[PDB]
Design an enzyme around this catalytic site. Structure first.
Site, PDB file in Angstrom:
ATOM      1  N   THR A 130      -5.960   6.417   8.509  1.00 50.53           N
ATOM      2  CA  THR A 130      -6.530   6.634   7.182  1.00 50.53           C
ATOM      3  C   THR A 130      -6.484   5.401   6.289  1.00 50.53           C
ATOM      4  OG1 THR A 130      -4.459   7.451   6.226  1.00 50.53           O
ATOM      5  CG2 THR A 130      -5.910   9.065   7.316  1.00 50.53           C
ATOM      6  N   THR A 131      -5.962   4.272   6.785  1.00 47.28           N
ATOM      7  CA  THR A 131      -5.983   2.990   6.098  1.00 47.28           C
ATOM      8  C   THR A 131      -6.653   1.978   7.003  1.00 47.28           C
ATOM      9  OG1 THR A 131      -3.807   2.357   7.000  1.00 47.28           O
ATOM     10  CG2 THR A 131      -3.841   3.371   4.793  1.00 47.28           C
ATOM     11  N   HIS A 161       1.773   9.238   1.610  1.00 45.87           N
ATOM     12  CA  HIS A 161       0.705   9.063   0.632  1.00 45.87           C
ATOM     13  C   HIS A 161       0.989  10.036  -0.503  1.00 45.87           C
ATOM     14  CE1 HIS A 161      -1.786   7.034   3.794  1.00 45.87           C
ATOM     15  NE2 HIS A 161      -1.024   7.802   4.562  1.00 45.87           N
ATOM     16  N   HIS A 203       3.424  11.008   7.079  1.00 45.13           N
ATOM     17  CA  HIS A 203       2.801  10.665   8.357  1.00 45.13           C
ATOM     18  C   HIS A 203       3.833  10.033   9.273  1.00 45.13           C
ATOM     19  CE1 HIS A 203      -1.427  10.481   6.358  1.00 45.13           C
ATOM     20  NE2 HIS A 203      -1.057  11.710   6.671  1.00 45.13           N
ATOM     21  N   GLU A 220      -3.683  13.535   1.761  1.00 48.08           N
ATOM     22  CA  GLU A 220      -4.923  13.046   2.360  1.00 48.08           C
ATOM     23  C   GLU A 220      -5.698  14.197   2.983  1.00 48.08           C
ATOM     24  OE1 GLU A 220      -3.824   9.446   4.719  1.00 48.08           O
ATOM     25  OE2 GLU A 220      -4.691   8.485   2.946  1.00 48.08           O
ATOM     26  N   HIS A 239       0.822  -1.208   0.000  1.00 50.10           N
ATOM     27  CA  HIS A 239       0.000   0.000   0.000  1.00 50.10           C
ATOM     28  C   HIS A 239       0.853   1.253   0.000  1.00 50.10           C
ATOM     29  CE1 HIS A 239      -3.108  -2.918   1.115  1.00 50.10           C
ATOM     30  NE2 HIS A 239      -2.370  -3.255   2.158  1.00 50.10           N
ATOM     31  N   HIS A 297       5.587   7.001   6.919  1.00 48.17           N
ATOM     32  CA  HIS A 297       5.240   6.609   5.563  1.00 48.17           C
ATOM     33  C   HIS A 297       4.648   7.829   4.880  1.00 48.17           C
ATOM     34  CE1 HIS A 297       1.471   6.126   7.830  1.00 48.17           C
ATOM     35  NE2 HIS A 297       0.935   6.603   6.718  1.00 48.17           N
TER      36      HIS A 297
END
Ligand SMILES: [Co+2]
Length: 257
Positions: A195-196, A93, A116, A103, A61, A91
């Protein structure tokens, strides 16, 4: 079996994870004119001098840079936080194009990416017990825009060709996350969620107002990663962001006037 595609993406997560439609989901749009300055917030304290990274992993992901969190090192405190939170991993996004990827959004503006830094509340002993608590986590979110290169990101960029596909990991020691922070610690804060999946509602979000700049070449290397495993049809790791979710009467506080 979740992902970011048409048949397994954010619009499908609620079936396996009904909290996806819960009361404090993330990310959200930050309406800067509706956020209120809170003069009772103490300064945010980011103490990363002893951070010790272990490994970087492509989880299918995103990629996670993991830290040894077994000792009192790499601590976030102050601001909206009670007590001390310990860094466990970071990590990103990011988008398929520079015009999307973050995000959180700021007055609907999407940044090219979002960093994040995930921390767990030390009162709960470890991450696993922390994610059973409404104040178990604090995530420091940092927006990325495309412009000048970020020198401190380059070590991450250069290791990505060794973790191209899902399930690859590389040892990744001595990375200094201080090199990823902007100058100002001005921030917005609100109570939210991962958020995942599993989208757990444990997070005090602290989203920095000042973005970092990264170069087009740096984010292009993010976009060469793969969601799929080795020996599987290539799907580029891009657009691994969840869109903004309903605020549901939460209040966003600003640390600055
Ligand atoms: Co994240």
């Amino acid at each position: 079996n979740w992902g970011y595609g048409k048949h397994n993406g954010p619009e499908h997560w609620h079936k396996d994870f009904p909290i996806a439609k819960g009361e404090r989901q993330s990310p959200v749009d930050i309406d800067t004119h509706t956020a209120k300055y809170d003069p009772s917030l103490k300064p945010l304290s980011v103490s990363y001098d002893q951070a010790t990274s272990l490994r970087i992993l492509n989880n299918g992901h995103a990629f996670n840079v993991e830290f040894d969190d077994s000792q009192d090192k790499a601590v976030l405190k102050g601001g909206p936080l009670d007590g001390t939170y310990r860094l466990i991993q970071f990590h990103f996004h990011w988008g398929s194009l520079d015009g999307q990827g973050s995000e959180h959004t700021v007055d609907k503006k999407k940044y090219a990416a979002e960093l994040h830094l995930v921390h767990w509340n030390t009162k709960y002993g470890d991450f696993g017990k922390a994610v059973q608590q409404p104040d178990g986590l604090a995530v420091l979110g940092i927006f990325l825009k495309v412009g000048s290169a970020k020198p401190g990101l380059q070590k991450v960029v250069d290791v990505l060709d060794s973790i191209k596909t899902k399930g690859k990991s590389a040892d990744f020691t001595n990375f200094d996350p201080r090199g990823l922070l902007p100058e100002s610690l001005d921030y917005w804060t609100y109570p939210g969620s991962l958020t995942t999946p599993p989208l757990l509602e444990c997070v005090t979000w602290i989203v920095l107002k000042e973005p970092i700049s990264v170069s087009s070449e740096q984010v292009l290397k993010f976009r060469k990663l793969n969601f799929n495993g080795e020996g599987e049809p290539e799907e580029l790791m891009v657009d691994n962001w969840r869109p903004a979710q309903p605020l549901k009467n939460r209040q966003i506080k600003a640390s600055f006037k």
